[PDB]
Paper text:
In addition to conventional enzymatic catalysis, PRPS enzymes are downregulated through allosteric feedback inhibition by downstream nucleotide biosynthesis products ADP or GDP21. To avoid potential confusing, we chose to use GDP instead to ADP specifically for the allosteric inhibition regulation study as GDP does not bind to the catalytic pocket as a substrate competitor. To explain these unexpected variations, we determined the structure of [name] in complex with R5P, ApCpp, Cd2+ ion, and GDP by co-crystallization. The GDP ligand was positioned at the allosteric site between Loop2 and the C-terminal α12’ helix of [name] with pocket volume 33 Å3, stabilizing the conformations of Loop2 and the α12’ helix for catalysis. Strikingly, in vitro feedback inhibition assays indicated that the enzymatic activity of [name] was inhibited by GDP with an IC50 value of 706 µM, while that of [name] was unaffected by up to 10 mM GDP, suggesting that [name] was insensitive to feedback inhibition. Indeed, [name] binds with GDP with extremely weak affinity (Kd > 200 µM), whereas [name] bound GDP with a Kd value of 10 µM. In contrast, 3AA in [name] sterically blocked GDP binding at the allosteric site, abolishing the feedback inhibition response of [name].
Numbering used by the authors:
A (entry chain D): 3 to 194, 204 to 305
B (entry chain C), C (entry chain B): 2 to 195, 204 to 318
D (entry chain E): 2 to 194, 205 to 317
E (entry chain F): 1 to 193, 204 to 318
F (entry chain A): 1 to 195, 204 to 317
């Protein structure tokens, strides 16, 4: 049967997942030692169980990554039948190639540390680059928020039939042209001094990318989109990291709303920013766990 | 502890140019097929203690050349070679780099694992379809760019290059073309299939389509037709990998290109004989230089700012 | 009860016979090639939690079938199948199982490592060239014998079998023929190349050459004529693997065989059209029984003493 | 090959001291964190064909320094280094070296395997909590001793060292002090919970263990040693973790000195605690690096110091 | 539930028989001998397809022959399509070589752990590892069982003055073990380290406790020191009864009232030639570990209680 | 630049000493004993840091203690920062268990190859593997040396009538070993098969030489010898590479009808020669020493297969 465990990163999403599966949380004490070493004490048997550990790459990332690895190692030495790392926001994903001299491929390093910890399956959401599925030798589910983003647009944008949907960088063109084609609307591209390609005159601009970290690029992209004359600017990003001065920049930018999923906890950031709206996706992870559980 | 260079049956000319630029001959290897079509590899010289480089591109009957490459690596490895480096100009199975459909394979990662398990210690390639294939291994992977030699070609061959527009034939290729456009200080544009859509205005100016490869060339021929319809003085196509499979030559001859420019990661002499529009950017000096720097133990970053020769 | 059988492009007939004998349908898989000759594999039905068997024989265009097999294994493995078993009746690269020359590869071990790294958990094959290839893995390898079905054939079709002579065309095929001689209670003989030399009798007796495979068939045709010039009644040739590459068919048409008997580890339908001496032994029930017993607990030890049907 | 030594963000002073003692400068690495708290590592000079040494101790925010160390190892490995050696003065997660509870992790082995897959070919550390951690790998792991340097400190600083009594504050540490007391040919003692076994009457008492974290079990162990009547009490621990309430407890305790090595930085601790003294072990690590480079035996560093 | 098979090696057949008997099973059909040239011969005479296999081999009596036999049995079961192969090793061999305390020294214990891993072992069940950190040699579950509950029950039921005894360590290495026992009995402890004794064995009973007894030189010299310090009776309760070389002669001449070991190593032949040696059948602790590991329960019971 | 060291195990110190003498080296400082409880104790009393280490241990005389000793020495040198560890094993143990011929049978040879691999061996140097395919049980270079040269030289220098002798295989499995030797001598050949013992070939009126790779209990060579005399041969010799002579072997050869029984010193023969006057030994220490010298440097060992230094 199923045991779902939660790490100290995003207890809310784990609770939603376990509720949707009709389970309890697997009882785990997750803290730090006096000298900041990660302390993981699982307080119930997992012998013969299919265990799922929910830990997102957010907060103090290395503590949560190491916590996840230690939970995997404990469950593996605990004679668990299978250990699955549920990672809604995959850490170190932007370091997925050697783009400069002597650079590390940190995402690949993370994939190998999960492998040697004892992970048998990975369930994640909107990988920055899909090719990260190839960093392993085990099944890696790359889930999409695209149905939930489409539904959010259709249910919240009055003028969605005549929007355009825009990318703030180059790399995000393929992500955008999908949903633009799925809504049957135009599309546009913003590149870095900032240049705009496409027609967003007298319509609604929805910026879409996989992630929003410092939000400098989407804020200057919204400013370019107002320069080109757009009745309203939205930003729908899957992972709402919001690091550093991000909140200040979205509060001063001219967005109608800024939409993210709950791959990362947003309550405290939503308290300091009124434009933020969060989507479900917890039902998408539960169905990947239940589908995985044969 | 010097260099031994061997050639596979997938591109002996490129191996010949590389060994020539390095002041070498090429290793004595017989690479044929058995009566029942099994690969036969006979290394005809000692390779003990040598730094071996094997040149095999993903082209032709791809699985025969891939299997030949793997057998060459394994023989050299149990031949007590000091190091074995697979130089793979066009990396095969690169478009199968993820699990997009329901039960699809990641063939590129499988290939990376067969190269790893054969005994490869180093990979030297050019313009990987996805750069993340460098992460499919646990060994160094040089992802060489043809971008500098393409820039040099454009400047030395395009009269109106100062006011051209670099166009991406698909969505996915926007990063490449904005890189090149930023390097020439020109404009860029994008074409998206669905009717085919053009964004970025290429009116009354030269249009250069740039992507990593040309297989069946349907997408770049349709893109070129759209560039004419939008009113573009001239339309070029500069692609790194000249696969040209199927009706590709028919489609390029029946399109409106002034030239279609590729590198010699794949043999092009037979293709150029049947298509007066195809131009080749010899990149054997970039591969020869990367091998030499790899041997000495020097930094290959020079190869991303300047063209040799 | 959770069993799936997928077929490659090499021996679809044998796959259908096996699935028929197990009362199953073949799994939904599209297995073709891309425009640039890369292998294209989409398994079109779930294998989640299933006991998967992939039947691909080492024959035809061998490297395309090997890559197809590896891509199917890796796909099923990433598709969360419980176990993936490669049913390979004729093992490719099996004759390359040692280092006899100064720089030779052990291609059989390379293949064992590529099947292992793809995700294979079990191997089911028939009459390995060398049995020690079982040790090239680290997973169970069922090496089935055609010996019982050959014994049944010899008993039921050769009238003078009680006083025949089982002959080896080379050395090393001595154990194969001595086991059949001890099991039929008959005589054995041996032929060594070096002008060919025969040791043993065959005078005024039916002669039966037995080996594991027949590729170019030069040695068994010269062996046949030597057996007639030593004064033998007839000459048969019973080989497990048909292959028949190169000029083999032409040579069998001119040789003096009464019959050439093979199993259907390799398709023989096209071969039988051009050679009237070729008779085929259906071994689909031995492979089907290996699969059904492998699914359940049940020991495969049957398939080495008596024939299923 | 030629030697390059790199520093992590943990204990930069020890890295500089080591590089100076080897007559080298530290290599160019920028090691910081991203806006979203991910580790950023940029090695700014070629290491192709080099024998690289990366000095990172298990201290401070340990998971950030461990993850940073792993990223440096991986970068140097893809940067075509000839050999990558992790110099780790204090090995993190070492106290998780066995399974004494249900569902417990063996975090020390997890770290050993992450170092292995990162690309480490050699490990140089000092006084592992348990020596058997050398077996968590399949690559050379040097477990150096501070014992000659603590002995030299104690002969050179304790006048009554000829007639002292070395004490273990817990059970598990009974062998270490027998290795040291017998090396001084002096009395030894033991404390368990507190009850004391061994003599400590009018003698002066020297606590020796591998660590001292929060120091509760050595502050109480000092109180028991005074109650049994010893002139002064000395605490000599290898790794100066001093986390949590450690400083307050030593400031309110009756130590003559608390001596640690510089496997972990102590400067911030020493400005706030007059009782902390540090032993320089930078030459003991430098000599193992030098011997490891040009192929000598580090056995000498367990009996002679520099 | 029952798809389990249990097999024996050539080392401790009595323990194998007791374990299988306690589980209500018969021992599996394996012929285990040596070839003419002294190579190990292993013939499993029954199917293990889909089975949860347990192989009982202790590190004792011609160690390399039994270790190599164990590895060959694991590999045979692995190629025989067993679902899981568990090595039950009551006394884990080469455990004293668990670190590098010398130049050019081997970690023989780690080598053995890697040979068991590469042979095909999926699980290890052992008792009183010399060092518990050997659990970290394996990357697989390793049960490190204790004789501590059975040693305490034996003490309470056989030492009358056990409430005022003295649990003594024969070397500096058993201080963790004996304090544990000392705390469980609520008694005093002592240590012996040239003969130096620290602790107060007053005029009472001294019980030496360690993990094993090989030659028995240390427990006997510790017994002499415990005499000279004036102690009533002295005992020795050791988990692993290796007793090699002149060990029995030295126990017969030493001042022991009794010397108690477990049956991780065969002791019947040893007990016939020494009236002092007593054995604590621990076959039920191993059987209940096999039974719980099959059908997947928690073995932590076995450290608080002694099932018969 | 000699970084070469050479240790010896407890199995064959004489052969190690001859090898090191021929290489102009001293034997490495190793104490190899047993603990009180019969556990293997290995203390290397010399640095091997950065050295090319060779450990000479043969599979003979109490196999498991010598195998375990070899493994502990490899592991010690590997953790001792040795540059490379090469296991020089003249007689490779467990070679006869190289396949699964019965149900639940072990492939002990592959297990041994995996324990040598996991100990840290980078190279294996052996002589006359029972099956050559055992080279594929590894993933590291394995030199399979032949005793065929020096056996040819022995026959020529000791048998007067060798120009018309007959090389006989005692079993159906050594026929390839025989056919080789005979072709190099240009002599007849024959084969013996225990079915009742049967002889195939001609050995009437001329000298007969039984040749196989080893002699364990010697049960077959002796009955084959009486068969060779009942079939009428002047003399009978027995030349085996590996002189194991276990069990009743010496008792059987002393009453056997051999002119001589010739073995190599892959196994110590001194005590065996004391109890059997018919035993001749061939020194192959120069073939092992040359395999080591060429393996160290970087030279083709393949000379050793037709020359005899
Ligand atoms: N992972 C895990 N280990 C268990 C469980 N139950 C028992 N163990 C065993 O417990 C041992 C270590 O903890 P344990 O002995 O129970 O703690 P102790 O009884 O206080 O010494 C190992 O042998 C584990 O195999 C369980 O449910 N999960
Ligand atoms: N790879 C390689 N192998 C060599 C070389 N020189 C000798 N060999 C050896 O040659 C052997 C195979 O060639 P050969 O002696 O003709 O085979 P054999 O006579 O049938 O055993 C192998 O054992 C190799 O180790 C060399 O330069 N390279
Ligand atoms: N192999 C396999 N993967 C599946 C199956 N069903 C769903 N998936 C996975 O589910 C994911 C699809 O979700 P998404 O891309 O967000 O639409 C893919 O990554 C697949 O790997 C199945 O039947 N087989
Ligand atoms: N790790 C490492 N990579 C190097 C070194 N020298 C050159 N490189 C190469 O630098 C390449 C980076 O390519 P690119 O994305 O164009 O970065 P660029 O070299 O700065 O232009 C990598 O693919 C490496 O092959 C080196 O010393 N170490
Ligand atoms: N290990 C094992 N092998 C089995 C079992 N049942 C059948 N086998 C087969 O046994 C074969 C070798 O033994 P066997 O068939 O009896 O003798 P053979 O005539 O040499 O094939 C292998 O090819 C296996 O496929 C089993 O339960 N366990
Ligand atoms: O373009 P499609 O033929 O649709 O897809 C494959 C394309 O691959 C290359 O980009 C060619 O230009 C082909 O057109
Ligand atoms: O030897 P060839 O005639 O050329 O090739 C076919 C032979 O291949 C093997 O030797 C078989 O015995 C076949 O008779
Ligand atoms: O003392 P408490 O258990 O906090 O733990 C801290 C101890 O950690 C080690 O034992 C040190 O000697 C410290 O005294
Ligand atoms: O006493 P020794 O002969 O030195 O060695 C064997 C005995 O002492 C050792 O520590 C073992 O524990 C045995 O108890
Ligand atoms: O005669 P056996 O008992 O079979 O074994 C000893 C034989 O072992 C070898 O294979 C030779 O044929 C020897 O004569």
């Amino acid at each position: 049967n199923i045991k779902i465990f939660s790490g100290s990163s995003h207890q809310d999403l784990s609770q939603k997942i376990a509720d949707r599966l009709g389970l309890e949380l697997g009882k785990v004490v997750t803290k730090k030692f006096s000298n900041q070493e990660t302390c993981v004490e699982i307080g119930e048997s997992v012998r013969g169980e299919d265990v799922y550990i929910v830990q997102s790459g957010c907060g103090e990332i290395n503590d949560n990554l190491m916590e996840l690895l230690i939970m995997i190692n404990a469950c593996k030495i605990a004679s668990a039948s299978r250990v699955t790392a549920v990672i809604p926001c995959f850490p170190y994903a932007r370091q997925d190639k050697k783009d400069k001299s002597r650079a590390p491929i940190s995402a690949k390093l993370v994939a190998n540390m999960l492998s040697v910890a004892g992970a048998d399956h990975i369930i994640t959401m909107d990988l920055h680059a899909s090719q990260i599925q190839g960093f392993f030798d085990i099944p890696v589910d790359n889930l999409y928020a695209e149905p939930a983003v489409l539904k959010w647009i259709r249910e919240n944008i009055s003028e969605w039939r005549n929007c355009t949907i825009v990318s703030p960088d180059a790399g995000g063109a393929k992500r955008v042209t999908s949903i633009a084609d799925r809504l049957n609307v135009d599309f546009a591209l913003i590149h870095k001094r900032m240049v705009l390609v496409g027609d967003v005159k007298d319509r609604v601009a929805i910026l879409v990318d996989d992630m929003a970290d410092t939000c400098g690029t989407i804020c200057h992209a919204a400013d370019k989109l107002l320069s080109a004359g757009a009745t309203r600017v939205y930003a729908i990003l899957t992972h709402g990291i919001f690091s550093g001065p991000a909140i200040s920049r979205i509060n001063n930018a001219c967005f109608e709303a800024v939409v993210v999923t709950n791959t990362i906890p947003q309550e405290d950031k939503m308290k300091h920013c009124s434009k933020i709206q969060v989507i479900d996706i917890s039902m998408i992870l539960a169905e990947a766990i239940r589908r995985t559980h044969n």
